[model samples]
Target chain A: SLRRGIYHIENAGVPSAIDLKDGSSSDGTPIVGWQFTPDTINWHQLWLAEPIPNVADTFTLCNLFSGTYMDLYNGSSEAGTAVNGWQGTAFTTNPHQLWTIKKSSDGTSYKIQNYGSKTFVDLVNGDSSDGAKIAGWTGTWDEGNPHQKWYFNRMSVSSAEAQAAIARNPHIHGTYRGYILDGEYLVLPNATFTQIWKDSGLPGSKWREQIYDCDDFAIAMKAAVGKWGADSWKANGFAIFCGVMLGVNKAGDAAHAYNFTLTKDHADIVFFEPQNGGYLNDIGYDSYMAFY
Target chain B: SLRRGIYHIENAGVPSAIDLKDGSSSDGTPIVGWQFTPDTINWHQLWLAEPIPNVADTFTLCNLFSGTYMDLYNGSSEAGTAVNGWQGTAFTTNPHQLWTIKKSSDGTSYKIQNYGSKTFVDLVNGDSSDGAKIAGWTGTWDEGNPHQKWYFNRMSVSSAEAQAAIARNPHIHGTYRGYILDGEYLVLPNATFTQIWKDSGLPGSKWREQIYDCDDFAIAMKAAVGKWGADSWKANGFAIFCGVMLGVNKAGDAAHAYNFTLTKDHADIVFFEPQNGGYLNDIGYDSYMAFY
Candidate 1:
């Protein structure tokens, strides 16, 4: 379970950061084999190995800062084909998104291999210095090699606990639970979501006074969700829920907005109405515009 | 005096009309040697031979329709070089603009030779059918060749006489006489000039209503001049004059406009104010904007 947390993916042989180009977390930034110094342990240093839904021993490695998934370029199985970080979709069927995690004997570390290529990701040339490139290689496994070894560390609480933590936050006035069809929602760390809300200055800001209308609540909720990468949200099945209000248009047909979180199992979609600090059974909207 | 008249330059050997490509009267259109019945005697059929001032026996052959001068492309003196009808300038010292007019025995025709290249303009392949090209040739000049012979005709009176005729035309208004520094002007046949003014609907059309402002008069004059290629005017020393009215502005620092016709001899610029039917000794404008 701790395998789903964030960890520093360091090259065992060179002890350098297996970093995206320029230590960028942005999608499509190539993964360089080695990067020396302070960057070796910062944003580029941390990666989240999230378990692939319904797929045993398979997971997607995402860069914490870029919020992009580590993926095979063109899904090529050819030798010397490069690896890059790209936006990933939820439950993506792309074989390139699948990485088989083989735990090392130390239990704290693991050997990550591309499932389709069956190749161990290696430090190009094993020169073991800085600025070298990294790629998948189809060769004999060498557990003795340092470049293929990676250590994992838990970076957050369980998603359910995190959701509860967000719902109880005293700074925000409204909340909701359960999914709304035809609406989008996003799931993020409760702290990040709280930060987005506070930054939005809800309920009283001159630009967005929530007491004035539903639009204010809608704007703030949308802003908070947008703070996260859309692609990353898609990969995690998280989105913001938006619906049009029916019969409640004292000033004409208006729309209302809220927030929601979904489990990988798709069992329950928890909805929160940001307007009244309450959980809603059903929103009185003619149709849902978006859902996660 | 007869040397400075309009002429039909025919290929002495091919019996084809020396025409601008596509019979285009547009400046810079290529000159071609083609034989088609109606085309054989249209706008491309007429060319003006104006005596080059300060250069005895030298002249520039201008296409009457296009208002462009027959010129060696890039002034190249080499064999097989292309020729085009380009905008000409008054007192232009370009050797390509200088053609040696050799009067034929019949007194009504001539042998036009490129003075700089010492070549006879010839029809390509001596072919007489339509769409053949024309170029300069340094080889022997076959007098018997139809492509080498040209027939001159009286198409218009002297430049001064033509200017007088334009001044007296009731369609236009006030006229003036004198050169203004730093300006450009154009000259066209009295008939063509009259047609342009008539077509402009002067004194009535919304676009040319001078009571509105100087812009109306300026635009109409420019339109008429543009109806003739500017380069052709330059070659023949004709232009339009534009100026801003200094003390005459009841409407605040207003502008004024007029037209000018130049003599082939580069002497006497005749000016005309399009608003009224009177002649001016001098225009009380701040400065002349342009004259060709």
Candidate 2:
């Protein structure tokens, strides 16, 4: 048994040819074993255009043309068999069901119940991650898997932005500081000086002699000795001496060491150095000490 | 042995007692004492004094004088110490060494030694995350491991637009679609609505009804027909449907089986009844072919 199939019927601008098998006309029929007029009509090549467009439909030739045309709705089995170009059925089974209209192979005019109601959809296929192409299809209600789980790049902003963003996932931005060749081992604080001589190391760690001439700088340092003593010579390792001062011996005594320090913001010496070097000229500089 | 300590001293004006031990004033040293001659200067009591207002070496002592003029220097280790006192003999270690001045204990006008030297510092403590503080220490150097990094809040120009920048580990700002909601059942494509609806016990199980209202609300699902086609759906006791709609299908053709699925990025289908009883309008308005 065959399942139901769709067939097309359209208006071709031509009226149907009415079947007159008995050979009768408007004038009376002649005797001698001849019937009067035939009651059926030949639906072939007839036209009956539809009122709506692109809608599915199902129908059988009018029952009035049954004699000449084959029966279209003969039994309930119209569901399992193909249309045999029939009409005037006593039981109309294929008359009602899902139907539609579409283009015929010839590509001329319109038709009805053209084929089983087809699903024309707008589909798409794309790269693993982007905007893709849209297409058309006619398929069963099933088979909607791969067609369903599609994703779109909503925040791509633009094609270039999208590509650029994807390219950056593996990279990162970093900041760097540059150094000069001449300043490779240069010391700071006395940055102007080219080199130092009394330092403990080579020319790379040369000590500056500015202490002998830069009176203002020395004065400032002495003035800030308490503050300086409180800290670990902030510029240590990168510069010269660890801020050590000297004093002279009195009358019959030896030179000594005085360890300058700050306690609660005031400057004081932790331990004094005996027999240590003293200030070259104490005539003018005498402020960093307590009156007592 | 006494540990080194540092102190200050000041001079309290007093005249040096002259000796007249020779017993002749004309000889300049006749007497062994009373060389100050307080009466020759003027009769006075508490007048401007040198440590003491007047000196009569041989006379009986009346009152003692004092001031903050005395400086006491500590003598701890002999390695490093600077002596501070009246300069003598240009620069001799003996004169610079610590000395105890002897004067009737008038307690003023003594000098101190060991002016300035010595180094010390302190340390800081904290955690490894952001916002740490750094301090000074003389014992050892800190390596600044993960536990010792810090961050500062700052503002800067980001794109041509000015904005605030975060230090250390910063998070990215963005817009997200969001995560899966509670009671939601995820599934593969080409699944059936009936199966999913029954299995999920959710009204949104209808693949055709997802995003139906365009109100921006998400569908809630409990279970779904998925990957394994009829097998999984049946196993899960769900009614399933599959439709990839990959290509055109002729009537009577074999239909593929699959699991239920949802169409995305589409408008809501207007239904005639409350529970979306039936689609009142379809894609493109006309009820011709479905927009799969």
Candidate 3:
């Protein structure tokens, strides 16, 4: 449950704050992804995710600048319904403007659900673009996907400048949820790759035939990068690489698949075995192809 | 001046419609550029650009789906301030929500100015991306640039679906206002180059040495492409190319500059003289630098 306070509703997948699209104080401004520009501050991205007075287990999101209450569009519980700003007593008296936030198992994020729509707010397609919009999406009642999870970093309007937020640099060019990073070509190795590899928990995963193999291991490694390596990677530039490799063994008897990447810092491809979490070298392979 | 009616506020530079960022029906939803997808209709993209009741020469935009009135942020006249949607009677009752639209001399578009801020609604940086936001920007009272001008194409809620709007497929990667097309590395020649070359009016433009010479002519040609060659090109996919040329004038003593491009239809680069409506062939030239 969220306590009464100002907050920056940060998206888990895109690593951006939920902002009033373009900082408009209008009653219907969109709640879209706000880029965390370190050099500048936008109060429009700040909101008071406060609990409704006398209401049980429900809250109202009031923007700092607009002072408008966030309201779900219409009364429809349809998927992808817009959640926008509105004015007046409706936010308290009406459930359409009411929200319920539950702390996730990770203890850092929350799944915010609407009282009227009974749906969680999702980052549309998990897009990282500046104005990517939010929607009423479906997920389990208690659990939420990265797109549906939000981190309510406590903030105060009284001293917003003092605790200024930042998302400064931009790195990725595409969606990470699907591992569709637009250009992983000519990248620098991720410094946090060691931790990310360990966090994947895939090193000792079962080696079942036709169930989970080399291709699966390679894929799971990319999935780990998308899940655990976003904040340090995205919109932050064009150097970090995340990819996979495929080639025949040196003996040319069987084929092998592993993770592959090229770092701009070194100008060479690096291969790693996802199954054992070790860098592959020397007895490389015959030929191979790569994908970003 | 716009009469009481519904309209699709189209951007001149990007060839897109003004949308209530996402289908957001909340207060402060941004008024941004909406892509025109040919197959489907988004009611959120349509608006009631109607004249206020009993108000002379003033209008308040009411969206079709949200029913919220558009308002400029914080009574702001500052450059790039937000223009968003709001609820209730504040729209027709206040100047902050009232708009004054004047048809440009071109007779096809209008520059919508805010009554309270005394600023025109501008497309920020003339950005072409979906969800690119609108702003309160400074401009001459009567005239407007491509980013400031908006075409009010009439629409009716009853007939909106019958006349669905569209902006399917994406073409250019960079901004056209600056002629900074990101990836023009591999492009097909624009088919309309023949007509575009004529539309430039460069054929008869006077050639003042060092004043408006070869380099100037080359730039003028690209400016024309940015202005008139967008509709059929943008978000419509790749294969279109618009660029410039530079080389020797078939003489080792003098340098010459022209326009050059490659069409996916043909293999080689085609050079054209913007000064006169003619294609350069055979007697090419020595070394020189070229640009888009």
Candidate 4:
């Protein structure tokens, strides 16, 4: 019998791993789907395998992140048929709903064969990029091919265990830390700084330190944190504050951009110098305008 | 070697499951904390495990949901010491950092012994309710009892797999489907209906039926969908319009409450009879004041 536990399924030929999309809604519908990404263990990458009754060694692969199940779409038995993540129900063991696990030579590896189609799970077009589609293929099993081989292991926890462990960790409102840039104190957190720097598209060799203007840094920070999950971060009680500081240089007025984070409920604040990877105790700009 | 994967740790003794508080923030911090809940898996109920380098079977438990680590308070290994979810760093495997996993005779269960404290993980007082604390205990191992023994499993997925699966399952703005309450037809999506119904709350056996005045239904619908996360259900990026209907009933001068969902981006609109779960083909009430 297939023991009830969590399992990691990997492509034998490639280094990529299977995962559910992050931040995807689990509103519970009939048709769900799957993709592949570079190996990274996140909630999106976890699958809880529950045994289907009456069928020995048969199980339903449910995404821990999305609460959906892996199944052959429409119970198709044909080769090259698509596999999708579907809402789980008691009838998960029906013909195409069942899968047979065959152990591979590499003690840790296995071949997951569909019960109805009798085909091995395959990455569509053997694409090795993130978010590549997954499907069932009629091709022969090639142990050397990562796409054909899979991995399985049980998790060491129950939902309660995971919850309790996490409860101990407290959540902080997004806040700023200080960073130094040009003898000027700017603020932002390390995570925010690194994120904005990479997103700025400015060469790391000359980030904020050399060529970039003040507007570039401010805009970069805004764009980076404003990505899709930005709202969620805010909803989770974090504040993303950024703005340009205007002051005077020897000739005329000088402008600099900076960003910082804070929480509404706590005193935790952090600031960052967008031009360079510096923490600022304070920004000495003459005047400033703030933006979220 | 324990393959890197997501895992959940649980107390073997009580009915409560270990969990991270839902909606908890994971901004970086040092002193992490934990709690327990009845078994239900959400982001708070996921954990990621990584192997400590050069260590034989030592691993650090990380919360997959919150991106925090299982940490000892100030790295103390004392008996009865509390456990927390700390921000992960290369040094997470420090003194009290590494955890030793020992398999049990049951073949599926194991004991998680802390390296720094040399104590097996334990639940506080065998408490069965939610929010119970988990910590390292000086007590002897009770294999027959739970709270100490744990199950380890690997989740088979990549971010890509998860992402794609979820991508196909689009999120719906709050909407409702049809419901029959007291000889009336109320239309809305199931989610919208269930949410509004629960939010409207119970006034005993007569809900949206007898006992409640016409205005009660309107206010309930207005208040119900106005709560948090309610705006997202704007019926395809539109809005749900609620109003107080003014007209003449048998009693004369009647004011009744009602709610409807609509899509401004499209022509889809649905109306509900607040006092009775009915879909109105056309509202006979005259003179209405809308509340967005």
DockQ of each: 0.00, 0.01, 0.01, 0.01
Write one digit per residue (lDDT tens) for candidate 3, span B1-292.
5655556678887887888876576888888886885323345665666566665668877665566777898869899899898774524567778888878767788888898888999998899988898999988756647889888865331111111110111211122111112221223234456677777677776664332456456655765554442322111111124554445544456656566654233334556677886765432553243333
Which parts of model 1 are misplaced by more than 4 Å? A1-18, A22-29, A33-55, A60-69, A72-81, A85-96, A125-130, A138-142, A153-158, A163-292, B1-292
- TM per candidate comes to 0.30, 0.11, 0.27, 0.28
**Tens digit of lDDT per residue, candidate 2, span B157-235?**
1111101111110221121011111111212221234434445433442222111111101111211222222222111
Chain B superposition TM-score per model: 0.50, 0.14, 0.51, 0.46
**Least well predicted 10-residue stretch by lDDT in candidate 3 chain B:** B160-169
RMSD for each model, in Å, please? 29.8, 43.7, 31.1, 31.7
Candidate 2 chain A weakest lDDT stretch, 10 residues = A178-187
lDDT of 3 by residue, A1-292 (tens): 5655556788887778888876666777788876784322345776666567777668877775566777888846888888787774424667778888888666788888888778888888888898888888877656647888888865332111111210111221122111122321212234456567788677566553322456556656764554332323111112224555455664657766577543322334456777787764432653243434
Rank the models by TM-score, top first: 1, 4, 3, 2
Model 4, A1-292: lDDT tens digits are 4455555566666655666555243432322124443223334655556666677666666665465667777666576677666665434546555777766667567777787777877776667677777777775544556666766644323323222322332321123111111111112335544656676453352332111235335444544443312322211111123332222233335544555543222134344566665655445442223323
Residue B31, candidate 2: alpha-carbon lDDT: 12
| Superposed model 2: Cα runs more than 4 Å off | A1-64, A67-80, A85-99, A109-292, B1-292
* Evaluation by TM-score, superior candidate among 2 and 4: 4
Which candidate order results from sorting by lDDT in descending order?
3, 1, 4, 2
- TM-score of candidate 1 relative to the true fold: 0.30
Calculate candidate 1's fnat: 0.00
